[PDB]
């Protein structure tokens with residue numbers, strides 16, 4: 113009964129979360145997951161400001177209303193060489209990573225570790241925050257509120 117949450121640096125409060133290192137989060141689970149980080153799904157404008165501060169990934173994830181990849185450098189294997197906030201237009205499938213936005217984060221790049229899931233609720237799951245530098249924080253809890261997701 114375990115879930116790993118890989119988190120990135122924050123850029124203007126926006127960060128990327130990958131559940132168990134694979135595309136596996138539904139749009140409902142994504143909102144719950146951000147809620148557990150005292151965060152919301154980013155708006156498009158919040159994501160564009162994050163991009164301008166240095167945020168990019170090579171992973172599709174939910175924002176409010178769309179599924180996107182922020183890209184600074186053109187890479188052929190990431191969003192087909194696009195730069196900017198790339199918007200996924202056509203897909204058969206429903207599960208991706210998520211982006212989250214925390215308003216209480218620093219205004220620019222914050223590459224300090226994340227060391228809590230402040231708004232998770234009581235539950236049976238061992239939830240582990242994994243930072244890119246390997247540091248980890250675990251707690252027992254839950255964050256999924258939709259039965260379809262559990």
Ligand SMILES: c1ccc2c(c1)CCNC2
Nearest residue numbers: 118119120130242243244
């Ligand atoms: C924290 C821990 C692992 C990973 C990330 C962040 C991002 C890319 N996928 C691996």
